[model samples]
Target: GSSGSSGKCETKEKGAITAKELYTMMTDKNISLIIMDARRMQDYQDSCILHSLSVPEEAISPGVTASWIEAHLPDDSKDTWKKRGNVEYVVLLDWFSSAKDLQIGTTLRSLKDALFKWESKTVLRNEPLVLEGGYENWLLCYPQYTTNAKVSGPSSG
Candidate 1:
């Protein structure tokens, strides 16, 4: 775990993936990813990347996180954690105030830890990416791409 000078979890460089890198890669890959928002549930539900699942870290247990990953990913991939045919990658994100808030940092480190525990044993070639600058950076540069997490299907009312 690479420790940072600030942040709630005494954060690290473990899964620090830049926002620009994320945008470019996701764009180039044609949405080849499964985004995981590590913010509090309500926050993520308010606004988030399309198709991103809310996996809150604060006050949550490690087992829950692992289970969450398993529920969304392949049955056996948790241990090996390679890019599967459908979900090419798992991208972690949170809401950071101009990349200054400690909240996002903590979440990033937490998610990184989970990935390391699951995949690092097999000589990790690729791992989860933490969205740099968090959602703030994303909305700043890509507001046109932002969307509400709440699903809106055809209503019968």
Candidate 2:
């Protein structure tokens, strides 16, 4: 005769993580992971976290494949196929939106959902995550890990 406890619904597992947490996990060269930028293609081209794939919002779909993701990677590092064979985690991020933002979360949600479905279908070890504070915080904490920059100013007497 009682409804579910007060206003709050069931708490779910967190879908977002911080930059420091990611960087720490990335220290191992043997770790199988993929970082993706979900911003505009132009923005991704202009600058992005090193080794991140450019998976713009328009391309997100439940049907996306590992091969499709591999194709988007840099030609020099086309070794993605090997990594895809045993990838453990996939991280997605925009310029600054985390899982909390209503607008950008729509796209992030779509991609993460697709990733989850893909994981179940492929029986592959995969976990999808959103980068908390997105690329902005990552860049702040680890500029050396990005493709472009605006970090320092002139240093002259």
Candidate 3:
């Protein structure tokens, strides 16, 4: 049910961050952020943040899910430990237009459930942050911010 990753935040109230807030945090060197784009392969290839991994909602099968858990979760490797704990944050992004707003919300709820199950059995203790407006709203609000920083800067004009 947890659509994105297998982890839980220390606090239940640690809600998602907005596009603007995410952008700001992206600039910080101390912050380790993982952006997961739950979109089609074509859309992901055409545009998306650097270092973002495309995990289409449909691609998440039992096998891939298990692999994801092994790779990014504890008891796998020390490197994973560096990135899989309560401190790491996974941001789930998808285009709101892909589905109705209500559907998007439903998908998020489903993901939350799935993630909780994984957290119960693993060392990952962070939850995925589901953005409300998705890519459309993200781009609308931050027109100049490109997935690649070279194309556009942090909107200082």
Winning candidate number (lDDT): 2
User: Backbone clashes in each candidate structure, one number apiece?
Assistant: 1, 0, 10
**lDDT scores in order:** 0.55, 0.65, 0.52
Model 1: per-residue Cα lDDT at residue 140: 66
lDDT per residue for candidate 2 within 53-98, as digits (tens), equals 6666665544565445445555644554345436776677776567
Prediction 1 global C-alpha lDDT: 0.55
> Can you list the residue pairs that collide in candidate 2?
none
Model 2 superposed RMSD (Cα)? 6.8
Candidate 2 is scored at a TM of: 0.68
The C-alpha TM-scores of every prediction are: 0.56, 0.68, 0.56
The worst-scoring run of ten residues by lDDT in candidate 1 lies at: 76-85
Put the candidates in lDDT order, highest first.
Answer: 2, 1, 3
lDDT tens per residue, model 1, 1-157: 5775765765556546776667666666565665666666566557777644555556333433444454554343333334432455566776652223435236555465566454423333367666776665667666666685233323356
Show model 2 residue runs off by greater than 4 Å. 1-13, 61-82, 102-105, 118-121, 151-157
